[PDB]
Design a protein around this nucleic acid. Sequence first.
RNA 1: GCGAGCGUAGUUCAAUGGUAAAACAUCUCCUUGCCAAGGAGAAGAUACGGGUUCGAUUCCCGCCGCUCGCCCC
Lengths: 174, 168
Amino acid sequence: TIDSGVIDEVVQFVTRRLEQLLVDEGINCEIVRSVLIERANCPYLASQTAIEMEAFSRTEDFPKIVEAYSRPTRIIRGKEIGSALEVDASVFEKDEERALWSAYLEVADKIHPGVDIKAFADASLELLQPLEDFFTNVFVMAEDEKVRNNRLALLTKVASLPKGIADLSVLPGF
Amino acid sequence: VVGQPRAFVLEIGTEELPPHDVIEATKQLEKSLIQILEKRRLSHGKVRSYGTPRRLAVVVENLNMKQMEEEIELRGPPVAKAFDQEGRPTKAAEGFCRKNNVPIDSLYRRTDGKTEYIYARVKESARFADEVLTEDLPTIISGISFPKSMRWNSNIVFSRPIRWIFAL
RNA sequence: GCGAGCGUAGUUCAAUGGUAAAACAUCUCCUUGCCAAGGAGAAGAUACGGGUUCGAUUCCCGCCGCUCGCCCC
């Protein structure tokens, strides 16, 4: 009988060897290091995603998406009171947050864990514009507990979209 | 007396070496030799190395008989520390002068950083380009390393016994 | 036991017998308020002890702990 730690150790070892293999054909270390923390299950999928995301990263629009998607992520860390509930259409504030929520609902249809990255940025580009207006005109400072929790939950679910495709922490643009 | 640059041949005649050590040794020797003469400001020409199961030769062509006698500017203490507001220069200036055997008037000020500097000109002591090799070769030869080694009559580590040395 | 390599801000790293440098993280602040984005500053270090020299992160020695062979296996 073998405990459940050995299988995780073997998976980690194979992932570390896959990273070494993928950095042998000129792929940037910070790109595979970000892809492999989430796409480490199927090696062929990882090899066909990390060989393509680097090529896409030269579209001159990649830093724009990198800055926008996780600008919300750096506020999530800290208070976790907003994780108790989800969004609703009763205590919602002025139409800025409603428009952002509508855009999020529209874009979430095309993003599923089984999607690739070809249409990822092409679908995420439409979400960027309301984000600036939101962060400049909602005052997400926690003054009322209910509105603070609702806004935190909405922001977390907005920032959680790439969960299943790639991570934006080991990203050089950051 | 000065002459003309002539060839320089170094051969380390050993016994039979493994086929996967001649390649390593003939590179470890030449790469580390084209560096020492640059450290000792020597002027060489076309350097090439040859290997054979019984010898590791290196030929350096047009090697001069003298060194480049040129002057170099040192870098002493900060000017503020070594020179006071009034009076004679402090102990650092005299220590520098007695260390490099240079007159006090030879010091000049050049502007760099926060404290500008104190600077002096000194010689380089050009030798005869043969004593340098005499004192340096026992290190360049012994700097070679192998995955496996042995000894034959001393505590010297090498892949196979060395039977003659031809350095001309 | 027996050899080597080592040790610098919290992390990663610069240099040579002489007033210790840079990123990042932290903090203090100037933008309309919280993260992103432009600016200024602050604090932050030579594992430890001795020797010589006017003066060693640098030269010598002792010790601390780490890493690798050998010993054991």
